[PDB]
Amino acid sequence: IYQTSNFRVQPTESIVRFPNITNLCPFGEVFNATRFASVYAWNRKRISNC
Amino acid sequence: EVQLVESGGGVVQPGRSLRLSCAASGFKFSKFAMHWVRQAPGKGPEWVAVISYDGNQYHSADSVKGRFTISRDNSFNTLYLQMNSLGPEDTAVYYCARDGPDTSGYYANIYFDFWGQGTLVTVSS
Ligand SMILES: *[C@@H]1O[C@H](CO)[C@@H](O)[C@H](O)[C@H]1NC(C)=O
Numbered sequence: 178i179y180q181t182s183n184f185r186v187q188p189t190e191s192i193v194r195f196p197n198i199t200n201l202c203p204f205g206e207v208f209n210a211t212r213f214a215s216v217y218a219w220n221r222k223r224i225s226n227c
Numbered sequence: 228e229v230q231l232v233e234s235g236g237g238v239v240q241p242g243r244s245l246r247l248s249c250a251a252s253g254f255k256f257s258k259f260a261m262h263w264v265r266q267a268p269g270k271g272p273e274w275v276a277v278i279s280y281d282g283n284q285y286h287s288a289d290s291v292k293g294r295f296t297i298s299r300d301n302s303f304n305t306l307y308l309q310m311n312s313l314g315p316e317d318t319a320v321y322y323c324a325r326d327g328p329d330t331s332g333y334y335a336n337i338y339f340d341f342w343g344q345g346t347l348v349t350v351s352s
C-alpha cells in the first residue's frame with residue numbers, strides 16, 4: 178500500500194460583504210487647498226466614515 | 228497717514244544716466260516690498276521692477292533689464308532707481324508703489340495699495 182497524492186475540495190462561489198455607505202471621501206479639501214502650512218507646524222487631518 | 232514723494236525727473240539728451248528716488252514716511256519702511264511703475268503719456272501703466280524688504284533679492288522686467296538698477300536704504304527711508312544708457316522709449320511718469328499688505332487667496336497675487344506723485348522724464352535735443 179502506497180501514498181500518492183492529496184485530496185482537497187475546490188471552492189465554487191465568491192462571497193463579498195462590505196459595509197454599504199456612500200459618503201465620498203473629502204480628498205479635494207486637502208489636495209486643492211489654497212494655503213498649506215509651514216513644515217515646522219504641519220497640519221494633520223483625520224479621515225473616517227468615507 | 229501714509230504718503231510718498233519722489234523727485235529727480237528732468238529732460239536729458241539720449242545716451243545719459245539718471246538717478247531718482249522717493250522717500251517714504253508714515254509707516255515702517257523696512258517691513259514692505261516696493262515696486263516701480265511707469266505710465267507713458269496717454270496709455271496705460273506698466274510694471275518695471277521690484278525690491279525685497281531687506282534688499283537681498285530683486286527682480287526686473289525684461290524690457291528694461293540690463294539698463295535699470297534699483298537699490299534700498301532702510302535707515303534713510305529712501306529707495307533709488309538708476310537708469311543707464313537711457314533711450315527715447317523711456318519717457319513716462321514714474322511712480323514708486325507700495326506692495327499690498329493682504330491678498331487672501333494664493334501667494335502670487337500682487338497689488339499696489341498706495342502710490343506716489345510722479346516725476347516727468349522726457350528726452351529730446
Ligand atoms: C448595508 O445595507 C443593509 C440593507 O440595505 C443595511 O441594513 C445596512 O445598514 C447597510 N450597512 C451600512 C454600514 O450602512
Ligand SMILES: *[C@@H]1O[C@H](CO)[C@@H](O)[C@H](O)[C@H]1NC(C)=O
Nearest residue numbers: 203204205206207208209210
Ligand atoms: C482637486 O481639484 C482637481 C481640479 O479639477 C480635481 O480634479 C480633484 O478631483 C480635486 N480633488 C483632489 C483630491 O485632487
